[PDB]
Backbone as numpy.savetxt, mean C-alpha at the origin, in Angstrom:
# Nx Ny Nz CAx CAy CAz Cx Cy Cz
4.23 -0.47 0.04 4.44 -0.79 1.44 3.29 -0.50 2.41
2.07 -0.29 1.89 0.96 0.10 2.75 -0.36 -0.31 2.12
-0.96 -1.39 2.64 -1.79 -2.22 1.78 -3.11 -1.55 1.41
-3.64 -1.93 0.24 -4.75 -1.23 -0.38 -4.54 0.21 -0.80
-3.39 0.79 -0.46 -2.97 2.12 -0.90 -1.90 2.04 -1.97
-0.87 1.19 -1.87 0.23 1.07 -2.80 1.50 0.57 -2.12
2.58 1.31 -2.40 3.88 0.95 -1.89 3.94 0.75 -0.37
């Protein structure tokens, strides 16, 4: 759910 980081 939090782009370039993961979910």
